[PDB]
Amino acid sequence: WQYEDCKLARGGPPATIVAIDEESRNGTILVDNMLIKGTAGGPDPTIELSLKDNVDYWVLLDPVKQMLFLNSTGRVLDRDPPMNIHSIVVQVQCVNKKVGTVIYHEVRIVVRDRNDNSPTFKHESYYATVNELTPVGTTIFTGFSGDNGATDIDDGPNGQIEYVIQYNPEDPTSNDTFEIPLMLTGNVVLRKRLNYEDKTRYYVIIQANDRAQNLNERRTTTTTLTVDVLD
């Protein structure tokens, strides 16, 4: 026999590691049961449980059930700029009332990024110019360089941008005449010969999408590139 109140009733490493999504509702359960040997509730508790290093009171303990809750009434657990909370580390202090001993059990909460932000274009519209003698294959727009196009505050794939020309019902030949062969630059290339005398102006719908790993979680935004033909 050893009297081991305040020890974990589990193997694995000493730290308890869990994951939640950013923007989880108030009262989200982080840990169902800490599995600390002893009884914190009731007539004669054997242990006293408390939280140390609980910066900004993001975590709350029900000591009877050894349940940890997310405390976010009137705030958002946001992983994206400007809040940038990627994890939460707190210490569950256990005091053994009978022997006067104290121990910390660490709890690492990893905050997973959600695709909660869309690509947003820096300008309402873009403009390019092409001489009608420009050869097919020539790059006629690079206006997205230096983050002058779409940006996405999410992290990793959720924040990475792909640029794709859409069919424009107001200008049907525009998506036949220009292409984005490299969807990560959004540089626009001429696909067909121009003729000032037939058409002086094109309206090119460009859609930016983020690269979320689940296709039906992807967010998208639209801009118009106006292309003017020069003679």
Ligand SMILES: [Ca+2]
């Ligand atoms: Ca967010």
Ligand SMILES: [Ca+2]
């Ligand atoms: Ca996010």
Ligand SMILES: [Ca+2]
């Ligand atoms: Ca995103």
